[PDB]
């Protein structure tokens, strides 16, 4: 995911426009964004390494 792609998604999704950012709930996230059952809710600095184009 090029930062070029991420900037394009940010602008296509409206995130460059001033907004209220809703505080989603862990529940609404566990429902609409389920972990495998891996049950591996990343913590520590590994949680940042994930974001380095992980598949």
């Amino acid at each position: 995911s090029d930062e070029e792609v991420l900037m394009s998604l940010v602008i296509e999704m409206g995130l460059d426009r001033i907004k209220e950012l809703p505080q989603l709930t862990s529940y609404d996230c566990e429902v609409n964004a389920p972990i495998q059952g891996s049950r591996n809710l990343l913590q520590g600095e590994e949680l940042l390494r994930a974001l380095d184009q992980v598949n």
């Binding site: 995911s1 930062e3 991420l6 950012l21 429902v31 609409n32 940042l48 992980v54």
Partner: protein, 93 residues
């Protein structure tokens, strides 16, 4: 539970913002302790990312966007769904 299409849109938007902020912050950590990006909520999600690295409250955590961000990130890492209504924009684009 039951999937709401609107929540899935707020979720993918928070994911794009988390991914931007990380890359933004990586581009900062090499270029000095900058913190110059003025994208809406970018500073916010950078501070969220640094919170949850050293955070240990886990699900008990009420700091805005920590619990949710940690769940969304963990999903995106392992999401191998072809069809995923959250990730499909990012994975494929």
């Amino acid at each position: 539970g039951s999937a709401d299409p609107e929540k899935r849109k707020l979720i993918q938007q928070q994911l794009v913002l988390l991914l931007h902020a990380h890359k933004c912050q990586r581009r900062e950590q090499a270029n000095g302790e900058v913190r110059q990006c003025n994208l809406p909520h970018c500073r916010t999600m950078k501070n969220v990312l640094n919170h949850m690295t050293h955070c240990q409250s886990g699900k008990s955590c009420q700091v805005a966007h920590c619990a949710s961000s940690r769940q969304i990130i963990s999903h995106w890492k392992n999401c191998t769904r072809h069809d995923c209504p959250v990730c499909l924009p990012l994975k494929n684009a």
